[PDB]
């Protein structure tokens, strides 16, 4: 299955695109 | 590490100095920063340089977005590749891709379809059904795991498939993926018969 | 979390998260104590409570 690391990376990439245009402590779990 | 999106914006903005960019340059840099994921700083510098090395043979007064996307595809996929020659088998492949695209659009709980193409680049690839990407899920602000959220969401519509007040379970949501994979074979069987079944529609049946 | 709280000699609940940062996940954490059990003897009542 898609792990939480991949899910949080996916979230991070989306956030980074939202920083590019229109200009988190869970890894332990 | 490799440059991120903001680093891509900064590197392309610095290396775009001294070059004529057509129209609003901010939009062009935005698109070429969205469309160059994983690239290095020297790769972005080269892509900016190679665009200005162009517009001489083509005699374009300024660097434009379609040509920028042309080099973006070129420097990571090689040759532009020719389209499939027109034939009866080409028409059948178009029919198979159309049936697959229609069943993908009619499948509840799926991401929006970006584009269905008959002509692609590279060597071993043909027609394709490309869905929306991050650079598309950004604009229409949507959860990254929206595909996972599509099961329990109610009263929505994606592509050509509507979902009412009864949510789709995980069983029905994943079992709805079998219909687009079977639609390629179903089109040939319905329109031609058993002897019309081909090797074009054989790979999805093995993952069903 | 309710059954872990009412089950005797169980680990203390640390944090119960249901989609913490709009991420599709949910978990009930427990403190990883170095005292008590570790590996000495596993009672059948303890194993049944865990199950």
Measured in angstroms, the resolution is 3.2
Chain A residue closest in CA terms to B28:
A21
Give CA–CA dist B172/A29, Å, rounded.
Answer: 30
Going by DSSP bridges, is the β-strand pair C26-30/B128-131 parallel, antiparallel, or unpaired? unpaired
Place of tokens 């509840």: B108
Give CA–CA dist B7/C30, Å, rounded.
Answer: 40
Q: Which residues pair with C30 in a beta bridge?
A: C13
Give how far Cα C20 sits from Cα of B106, C24, C25, C27, Å.
33, 8, 8, 9
Output the CA angle B98-B104-B109, nearest 5 degrees: 165
Query: Is the Cβ–Cβ distance between B101 and B129 less than 8 Å?
Result: yes
Which residues of chain B lie closer than 8 angstroms to C23, CB-CB? 145
Query: Is the Cβ–Cβ distance between B112 and B157 less than 8 Å?
Result: no
Give CA–CA dist B147/B70, Å, rounded.
Answer: 30
Give CA–CA dist B6/A12, Å, rounded.
Answer: 13
Selected residue of B4, B138, B139, B147 to mutate for chain A interface (largest A Cβ count, 10 A): B138
The torsion defined by the Cα of C6, C9, C11 and C16, in degrees rounded to 10, comes to 0
Output the CA angle B146-C16-C33, nearest 5 degrees: 135
Which residues of chain A lie closer than 8 angstroms to B2, CB-CB? none
Experimental method: cryo-EM
Interchain contact C6–A (C-beta under 8 A): no
């Amino acid at each position: 299955q898609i792990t939480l690391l991949e899910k949080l990376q996916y979230h991070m990439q989306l956030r980074s695109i939202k920083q590019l245009n229109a200009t988190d402590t869970l890894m332990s779990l | 590490p490799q440059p991120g999106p903001s680093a891509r914006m900064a590197i392309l903005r610095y290396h775009a100095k001294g070059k004529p960019l057509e129209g609003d340059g901010q939009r062009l840099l935005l698109k070429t920063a969205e469309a160059t994921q994983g690239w290095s700083a020297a790769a972005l510098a080269n892509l900016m340089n190679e665009a200005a090395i162009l517009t001489v043979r083509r005699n374009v007064p300024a660097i434009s977005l379609p040509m920028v996307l042309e080099l973006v595809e070129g420097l990571n996929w090689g040759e532009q590749a020719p389209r499939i020659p027109d034939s009866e088998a080409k028409d059948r492949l178009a029919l198979i891709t159309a049936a697959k695209a229609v069943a993908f659009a009619l499948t509840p709980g799926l991401e929006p379809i970006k584009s269905v193409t008959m002509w692609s680049g590279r060597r071993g690839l043909g027609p394709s059904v490309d869905f929306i990407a991050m650079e598309d899920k950004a604009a229409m602000d949507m959860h990254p795991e929206e595909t996972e959220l599509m099961g329990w969401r109610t009263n929505f519509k994606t592509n050509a498939a509507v979902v009412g007040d009864e949510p789709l379970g995980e069983f029905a949501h994943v079992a709805g993926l079998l219909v687009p994979l079977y639609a390629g074979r179903a089109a040939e069987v319905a329109l031609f018969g058993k002897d019309g079944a081909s090797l074009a529609t054989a790979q999805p049946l093995a993952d069903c | 979390a309710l059954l872990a709280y009412i089950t005797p000699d169980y680990e203390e609940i640390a944090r119960v998260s249901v989609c913490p940062l709009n991420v599709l996940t949910g978990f009930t954490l427990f403190v990883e104590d170095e005292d008590k059990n570790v590996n000495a003897i596993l009672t059948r009542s303890e194993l049944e409570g865990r199950m």
